[PDB]
Each structure stands twice: as structure tokens, then as C-alpha cells.
């Protein structure tokens, strides 16, 4: 018997099984469970991969977005511009620090923050005069880099801080700049299903600013000052475990080949499916991390059921955009509302997508989708 | 070179069990909230005699989340020790409330109960902040004075979060540390009496509603469904791999607590007359996260121990109310002279369940020698 996985961690582990065992056993034996050598080693190796001078490992990708807001003093009285079509963390951290998220729609093709509407949202916030614009958190949704040149042009006028939410986009790139290396600071997650993932919770932050890096390293260890005995700011506890850094070192050594595989797999879906469903085209000069391979379909509920009847898993990202969820629905939304974010949940679907998807399994998936849409 | 807290000797004792447990998790691939997490919540719950255990990412988060559930924030006061690890006060600041620092007893090093009453009354009398909560710490594994604190909180309508970061395994009158107050919190930082091999934590309560709300907060404020968050939360989970480690640690904890009791009593009896020793009050078992004495010329003592290959550590060098980050917050009437003088004389010695008679004798010999005996 054979079967397919949505994101196949087992196939990946099989590839590097004994290397993972050794890396884990070394940490277990050495007894340096907190900030042991593998942590700094991973920060360095990931830094060179991404071309960023500073990598600050931490506990998870939510923490990774919160800490930069804390270092900038963002909090009560302050507005942070975020997509609604994203994972809750992007907006939640803004509320957690006492600031308000302001929700911006996404582009109907890239699923990433709409730049024109961002500009309008900032202008409306200034006109209302109740909050001060402080930051923008674009998301590289599904692995595809957001439009950082136009977003930064807006930030330049307004003095705003940009945090790249690269939770889903490690391995992605746009005109030879790696995802992670945009904005003032980048953030990611090593949640196990991400393109670069560990075997527990983990995260990191990225920046070329040495001062910002020093502040982040303070914040993640209770706001430690220049000495071991005096905390100079409010912080948190947000460390990447040595044991998870050891896992990540082995994941990182195969990430680039896996990115080639993902690109190959995505292109094969796009060429085979473009006439029956809406496919995620890769714009010139981009590589996506393909955290998800997301299509839009007529009768999407019908399609998903037929895929499951044929033993094919699929997932809807996202069922409820943030601005419609109870916790965030009272926060302000950009002028014009969020029609794209509101309508995508009725038609979007993510398909199995990982480096180990076989030709045969992909063919089967293609066949079911084409068949559903009346192709013989 | 002698270990301060010997995780190596502990690991050797359960080496194969740890390896099997870790192997199992690695192969199963349920790395987030895998079965070992719930298994561990159940077993720890049985050990502590609480109805609900909510595992989480670390002992700091474990203090923060209950404050969030209570809506504690701007305009509110939470009463805490200055003589403790930063997290105890930090989380109060982090939610927007203010810590109000209370001094500690010069023998137990735990929150002074009379001065807590003074502090609550004074904050009410002042009228700038509303009293919401108290976070006593079971410092070094010794339970705080919960009968008195609980009665005060009931009278004043305040919420008690027990900071049991250092006290799992400790008991007071047949009540387990972690089971006091409205909710308890702990750390599984590797050096704690119950520790994992990374960061981890947990919260404890008998209130089913609070437990459900805490399970929501630690996963971004999840509502009754998968797709609609109803409150602001965080990401605070205990990894499956660490739960697996913790199950093995828990299975030898009671024996280790007996060993720690034996080791500390032998220290107290042999050092009684040369230094101030941490006496165990009747009806208590301490978790002995640390074994803390006070000595004349403590700096000389520490250097002498170190010259003889024996590590020791000063907990704490700078009380929180003097630290830059917290120095602007209010202090209880009378000030905190105990918290301000302890750093000149306190010192913690090697303490763990595997301390050999030979190592302990050496340590004892050096301290007694230093003081002329
Ligand atoms: C876009 C985005 N941002 C932030 C996060 C939060 O990361 P973590 O899951 O490590 O808390 C996620 C989670 O995967 C995500 O998809
Ligand atoms: C008394 C006390 N409370 C809270 C904490 C925070 O726990 P964690 O280190 O798991 O963040 C510590 C850490 O040792 C502690 O000693
Ligand atoms: Mg962790």
C-alpha cells in the first residue's frame, strides 16, 4: 500500500535519519541544553544562507514578531499595519504589546498586502489623529515575497518600521535578496511544517542592524543589560533550544536542494492545472518557499471532498480572515474594506506540497482536479 | 571539577529510559502537542494532587498567562517579592500592570506577610492603582506562607498565582507546591528540581474554567472552534520531546526529593555553628532548588571554595527593585532592607540528588576551615 502526505516530515527524516539521530544524541550527551554551541552555529550558518549579518534565534515565530515591536517602544497609542489574510500571530502581537492592528487587504493573485490600500490606511489613520502610525508587518504568504520596494517607499515617507513576517518563506527569494532579509528586521518560525522546520517550537529574527540585534538579544533574555545582574528593559524568555538548533543544522544542509524540488513541483502543478483552476504563478525573478501550494477553484468544497474521496488531503488556508475573528473584529480596517480577504475563503485550497511528492502522486492529484472540472 | 547541579549523574541513572523516550517521539512525528504532553499533564497532576495541569513553553509564560486571563493590566497592582528571579515582576510589567515590591523574611527568604498587608492597604489608601493580585514565590524550593496569604487575598478580593518555579517536589502540611493559591506556575528549565532538556513550564489549578481559558491563551486565544480566536493569546507549548523527557524525570522525582532532604539536613547539621543555615520548618519538605546559607566575609568564602574547585553562586546579586528595569515601581511601607542586605552575605552551595558523601564532606571541610573550625 502507498499513500500521500500533505507535508511529509517522515520522508524528510528518512533522508537524513542517522544525521538527525547523531545531532540529537550529541546534544543530549553534552548537557548544554540552553544556548549550547549548536545555537550560535545555526545562527551563523543561517545568516550566510540568507545574507544577513545577524541571526537571533528565539522560541517561536510569534515571539519573533513581538520582540521587534518591543525594542521600538511600540505600544499604547500606536498603529501597526498588517494583513487580515494571514495567521493570527501577525496581528495578535500588535494587540499584545498594547498597540492596535490596522487591517489591509491582500492582492487577489499574490495573496500579499495590497500596497495602494496600505498607503490609504496610513493616511486615514493620520487623518483620524487617534493613533500614531509606527510599523508595517507585511507577510510573505505561502512562501512568496511581498512587494517590499513599494512598501518601503511608503515607509520612507512616513518613518515607519518594517517587520518582514517570513514565517512561511525561508528559502524564498526576490531579485536575489533572500526572504528574511527585507525590512528593518525579519521574523520566522521553525514550526515543524514550515519549509525550514524543527521538531518542536522555534523561531528566529534577522537584521543587518547591530544595535537592533543587541537589543533583541537582550529582550529574549528578560531585558538583560551590559552585566549579568541588571536588567535594563522589560523582556521575555524566548530561546531556541540547543536540541532544536541541532535538528535545524541538519535541515538547513538540505534546504537548498529541497527549494529546487519545491520549485520543480510547483511549476509542474501550475502548467498542468492553469486551465481548470487559478494557479499561483511565480513572478519573474522570484523563488517561493512554497510553504503551501494554493489554488482557487469553482465549487471548492466539492473539489476538496472529491480529493479526500481519492485519498488526497488538502487544507483551506484561511477559513476566517483575522478581521472577522472575534478577538480582532473591533480593530480598524483600511478604507474600502477587505473584499479579497473576505471572498478568498470561499474558493481557495492548498494541495499537497513538499520536496518528496512523487511524480505518480502529483499525477494522481492533477488527474482528480482535472476530472472534477470535466476534463476527460 | 565538581558540579554545582549535576545533570550528568541524573542522566546516567535513567540513560536508557531517556533514550527510548526521546527515540519514540522522534520517530512518531507528533512534535507539537503529541501524546506525551497530555500524559505528562496527567501524571504531574496526580503527583501534585491538582485537577488540571496546563503544560506550556516556560516558567515566565506560566506567570503571565494567568494575569492575562484575569484581565490584569494598566491601572492595576500585583504584589511580588523583590528578592526573586526577574520573571516574577517582569510579567506584571509586560501586561501593563505595576509590580509592588514586598520584602522577604530574613530566614525563609519568602514574602513577608505582614508587609504584604501594609502594601495592599497603602496602595488602596493612595488610590492610584487597584490591587488585583499577589505572586508569592517558593524561593529555593521552600513554600511561602499560604494560610496567611490566602486569608488576606480572600479578604481583599485578590488573585494568588503561586510562583513554584523552584518548588516542584516541595510540600507544606501535605499540600504539594504548585497546588496553592488560585493557580500555580512552574519552570522546567534544566536546573530546576524537575527539569527538562530545553525550556518548558506548566500551570496548575483546580478551577476547570480557568484551566480551559489558559489552554485557549497558550494557543493564540482559541475559541470553541478551530477557526475563531476569541481573546488575545500567545504561543506557549511544551514540546512533545520535552514532555517525554519530563515523564522520565518525574518517575524518579519523589526518590530525588528524599535524597535532597537527606543531603540538606546533613549540610545544616555540619554547618550550623559556622554559618547561617536554611532550617526546614516542621511540616515542610523543600524542593532545595538551591541550598542557601549566609556567611561573614561571603566574598572570601566564595573565592576560597572556588580555589578548592568547588563552585558556588550568589542568588541574588541585585534585588529587582534596584534593577534599572523595575527601579521606578512602588515599594511596600518601610522599604526592603532584608532584600537589600541579603546580597552581601547569601551564597548557594552545590545541591542536587547525586551529591556524594565525599563531595559534601569536602565542601563542608572548606567552609568550616574558612571559619577556623
Ligand atoms: C505568517 C505567520 N506568521 C507567524 C506565525 C507564528 O509562528 P509560530 O507558529 O512559530 O508561533 C505563523 C505560524 O506558523 C505564520 O504562518
Ligand atoms: C522564581 C522563578 N520564577 C520564574 C522563573 C522563570 O522560569 P523560566 O526560566 O522557565 O522562564 C524562574 C526561572 O528560573 C524562577 O527562578
Ligand atoms: Mg520551546
TrEMBL record, chain A:
Binding site for pyridoxal 5'-phosphate: 61-62, 168, 189, 194, 237
Superkingdom of this protein's organism: Bacteria
Coiled coil feature spans: none
Molecular-function GO terms, alphabetical: pyridoxal phosphate binding; transaminase activity
An example Gene Ontology biological process: polysaccharide biosynthetic process
InterPro entries named in the record: DegT/StrS_aminotransferase (IPR000653), PyrdxlP-dep_Trfase (IPR015424), PyrdxlP-dep_Trfase_major (IPR015421), PyrdxlP-dep_Trfase_small (IPR015422)
Location of the active site: 194
Sequence positions bearing N6-(pyridoxal phosphate)lysine: 194
Pfam family, one: DegT_DnrJ_EryC1
CDD domains cross-referenced by the UniProt entry: AHBA_syn (cd00616)
Keyword annotations from UniProtKB, A to Z: Aminotransferase, Pyridoxal phosphate, Transferase
The keyword Manganese appears for this protein: no
UniProt similarity note: Belongs to the DegT/DnrJ/EryC1 family.
The protein, known as: DegT/DnrJ/EryC1/StrS aminotransferase
Amino acid at each position: 500500500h502507498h499513500h500521500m502526505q500533505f507535508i511529509d516530515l517522515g520522508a524528510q527524516r528518512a533522508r537524513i535519519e542517522n544525521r538527525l539521530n547523531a545531532a540529537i544524541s550529541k546534544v543530549v550527551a553534552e548537557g548544554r541544553y540552553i544556548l549550547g554551541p549548536e545555537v550560535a552555529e545555526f545562527e551563523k550558518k543561517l545568516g550566510e544562507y540568507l545574507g544577513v549579518e545577524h541571526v537571533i534565534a528565539c522560541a517561536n515565530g510569534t515571539d519573533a514578531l513581538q520582540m521587534p515591536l518591543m525594542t521600538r517602544g511600540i505600544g499604547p497609542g500606536h498603529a501597526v499595519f498588517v494583513p487580515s489574510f494571514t495567521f493570527a500571530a501577525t496581528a495578535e502581537v500588535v494587540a499584545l504589546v498594547g498597540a492596535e492592528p490596522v487591517f489591509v487587504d491582500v492582492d487577489p493573485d499574490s495573496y500579499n498586502m495590497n500596497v495602494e490600500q496600505l498607503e490609504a490606511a496610513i493616511a486615514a489613520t493620520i487623518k483620524e489623529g487617534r493613533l500614531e502610525p509606527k510599523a508595517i508587518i507585511p507577510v510573505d504568504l505561502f512562501g512568496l515575497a511581498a512587494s517590499y520596494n513599494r512598501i518601503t517607499a511608503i515607509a520612507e515617507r512616513e518613518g515607519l518600521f518594517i517587520i518582514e513576517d517570513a514565517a512561511q518563506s525561508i528559502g524564498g527569494k526576490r531579485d536575489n535578496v533572500m526572504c528574511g532579509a527585507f525590512g528593518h528586521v525579519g521574523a520566522t518560525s521553525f514550526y515543524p511544517a514550515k519549509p525550514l522546520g524543527c521538531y518542536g517550537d522555534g523561531g528566529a529574527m534577522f537584521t543587518n542592524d547591530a544595535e537592533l540585534a543587541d537589543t533583541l538579544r537582550s529582550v529574549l533574555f528578560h531585558g538583560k543589560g551590559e552585566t549579568q545582574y541588571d536588567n535594563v528593559r522589560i523582556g521575555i524568555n524566548s530561546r531556541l533550544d540547543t536540541i532544536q538548533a541541532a535538528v535545524l543544522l541538519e535541515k538547513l544542509a538540505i534546504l537548498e536542494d529541497e527549494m529546487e524540488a519545491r520549485d520543480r513541483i510547483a511549476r509542474r502543478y501550475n502548467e498542468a492545472l492553469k486551465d481548470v483552476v487559478k494557479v499561483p504563478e511565480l513572478p519573474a525573478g522570484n523563488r517561493s518557499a512554497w510553504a503551501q501550494y494554493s489554488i482557487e477553484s469553482e465549487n471548492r468544497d466539492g473539489l476538496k471532498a472529491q480529493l479526500q474521496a481519492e485519498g488526497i488531503p488538502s487544507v483551506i488556508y484561511y477559513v476566517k480572515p483575522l478581521h472577522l475573528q472575534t478577538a480582532y473584529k473591533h480593530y480598524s480596517v483600511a478604507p474600502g474594506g477587505l473584499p479579497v480577504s473576505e471572498s478568498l475563503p470561499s474558493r481557495i485550497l492548498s494541495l499537497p506540497m513538499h520536496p518528496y511528492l512523487s511524480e505518480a502522486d502529483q499525477d494522481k492529484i492533477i488527474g482528480v482536479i482535472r476530472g472534477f472540472h470535466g476534463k476527460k
